[PDB]
C-alpha cells in the first residue's frame, strides 16, 4: 500500500547538479512531513533535511544548506532533492522518508548517486555451473550498484550474494543458490542482473 519510489540517481561529474525524485502512493502525501537521509558506501546515516506539508518550513543540516534544496509537489505527490556543485563526498544512497520518529515512520528503497569523472560501464555476466549449488559471476561494472536476483526474485531461500569488490576502477560480485538436486537441472533456474546506471537488464539461464 504505502510506497515511496525513488529515482534520479546515477553518475554525475564533480561540480554538477542532480535532482532526485520520490514518488509517494498509498497515503495522503499532502498531510505528512517528508525527509531526506543519505548513506555513503560502508558508512552510517546523515540526515539531509525535511519539509512540511505546505512547504513553508524546510530544515537542513547546516553544512548541507548551500548545496541541497528540498521541494515538493503535492499535486504530483512527489518529493524532490536538488543538489548542485556536487563533489566526491556526495556519493551515497539517498533515502526519502515519511514523518521520521513517529508511528508513520517509513523509508523508501533508496537511489544511488555517484560523483565521478569515470565512465559508466555495463557488467559482463557468466554462469556458475558444477542438493546442488549454482551461481552467476558479475564483472567489470561501474558505478555501483548491481542487483542480482534468481527467477525474478521468486527464488530466495538459499541465495547467498557476497558484497561487491572494487579493483582497478571496476566492481565485481557473485551470487550463488543452493537448490535440491531433484529440482535442478530438472527445472529452470535463472539469474536476473540489473545495473541501473547503464540501464542494463539481463538474464542468464543456468544450464548443464
Amino acid at each position: 500500500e504505502v510506497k515511496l519510489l525513488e529515482s534520479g540517481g546515477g553518475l554525475v561529474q564533480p561540480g554538477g547538479s542532480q535532482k532526485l525524485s520520490c514518488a509517494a502512493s498509498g497515503f495522503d502525501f499532502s498531510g505528512y512531513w517528508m525527509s531526506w537521509v543519505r548513506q555513503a558506501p560502508g558508512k552510517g546515516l546523515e540526515w539531509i533535511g525535511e519539509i512540511n506539508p505546505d512547504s513553508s518550513t524546510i530544515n537542513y543540516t547546516p553544512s548541507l544548506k548551500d548545496k541541497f534544496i528540498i521541494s515538493r509537489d503535492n499535486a504530483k505527490n512527489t518529493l524532490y532533492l536538488q543538489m548542485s556543485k556536487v563533489r566526491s563526498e556526495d556519493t551515497a544512497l539517498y533515502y526519502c522518508a515519511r514523518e521520521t520518529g513517529t508511528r508513520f515512520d517509513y523509508w523508501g528503497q533508496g537511489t544511488t548517486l555517484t560523483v565521478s569523472s569515470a565512465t559508466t560501464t555495463a557488467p559482463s555476466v557468466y554462469p556458475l555451473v558444477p542438493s546442488v549449488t549454482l551461481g552467476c559471476l558479475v564483472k567489470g561494472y561501474f558505478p555501483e550498484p548491481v542487483t542480482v536476483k534468481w527467477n525474478y526474485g521468486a527464488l530466495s531461500s538459499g541465495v547467498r550474494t557476497v558484497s561487491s569488490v572494487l579493483q582497478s576502477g571496476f566492481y565485481s560480485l557473485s551470487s550463488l543458490v543452493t537448490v535440491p538436486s531433484s529440482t535442478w537441472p530438472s527445472q529452470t533456474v535463472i539469474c536476473n542482473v540489473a545495473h541501473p546506471a547503464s540501464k542494463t537488464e539481463l538474464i542468464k539461464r543456468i544450464e548443464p
Partner: protein, 210 residues
C-alpha cells in the same frame, strides 16, 4: 549538532540470550515535557532502515515486545531479549531534541552460534567467458561460522595469489552463518596451460582437472 556515540559491533550473542546495545548522547535528550527524544532503527542487510522504538517508550508497529530501551538522559541501552537469528543487522540510535537529526555510527549485532565448517564448491570458468580473454575460477564456501576463514588457491599444486578476489556475505537471517566466494581470474591462455585447480578452506579442499 548533538553527537551520538555507539560501538561498531556488539559482543557475540548466543541465540535465545539477551543482547544489549548502548548509545551515549553529548547533550541530554530529556526535554522539560518529560519526553526523551531518542530513537532506535534497525537496518537489515540490503534493506533501508526501519524504526524500532521512538521516544524511548514506544514500539513501532510490528516490532516485537522483545525490544526495549532505557537510560538516564545521556546514556541509553537497547535490550533485545531472546535474540532470534532474524534480529541480525545494524542498530542505529538517533535523536531530535535539536535540529539537525543525528544518528549514531551503528552497531552491528553479532550472533554467536555453533562452529560450522564450510560446504565448499568449485566452479570452472564457463566456456562463455573464454572468448573474452579471461577465465575466472570460483570457490564458494557456504554456511560456516565463525567469519574469519582463509582460502588458498593452487594451480597444478602450486600456490597462486595473483588475480584472486575474496568477498563475504553478512551473517545469515535464518541460520546465523556466513558464506564467502573467492574468484581466481586468469587469462584464457594461463587457464588452458594448466590442468589442476584447487581451493582449500582454513582443512577442506575441493579441486578439478580441466
Amino acid at each position: 549538532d548533538i553527537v551520538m556515540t555507539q560501538a561498531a559491533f556488539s559482543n557475540p550473542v548466543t541465540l535465545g540470550t539477551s543482547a544489549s546495545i548502548s548509545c551515549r548522547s553529548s547533550k541530554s535528550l530529556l526535554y522539560s515535557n518529560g519526553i526523551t527524544y531518542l530513537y532506535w532503527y534497525l537496518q537489515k542487510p540490503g534493506q533501508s532502515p526501519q524504526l524500532l522504538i521512538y521516544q524511548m517508550s514506544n514500539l513501532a508497529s510490528g516490532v516485537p515486545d522483545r525490544f526495549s530501551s532505557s537510560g538516564s538522559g545521556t546514556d541509553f541501552t537497547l535490550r533485545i531479549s531472546r535474540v532470534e537469528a532474524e534480529d541480525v543487522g545494524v542498530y542505529y540510535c538517533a535523536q531530535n531534541l535539536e535540529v539537525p537529526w543525528t544518528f549514531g555510527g551503528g552497531t552491528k549485532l553479532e550472533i554467536k552460534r555453533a562452529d560450522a565448517a564450510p560446504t565448499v564448491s568449485i566452479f570452472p570458468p564457463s566456456s562463455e567467458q573464454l572468448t573474452s580473454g579471461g577465465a575466472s575460477v570460483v570457490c564458494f564456501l557456504n554456511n560456516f561460522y565463525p567469519k574469519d576463514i582463509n582460502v588458498k588457491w593452487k594451480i597444478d599444486g602450486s600456490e597462486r595469489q595473483n588475480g584472486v578476489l575474496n568477498s563475504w556475505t553478512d551473517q545469515d537471517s535464518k541460520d546465523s552463518t556466513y558464506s564467502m566466494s573467492s574468484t581466481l581470474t586468469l587469462t584464457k591462455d594461463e587457464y588452458e596451460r594448466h590442468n589442476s585447480y584447487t581451493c582449500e578452506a582454513t582443512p577442506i579442499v575441493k579441486s578439478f582437472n580441466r
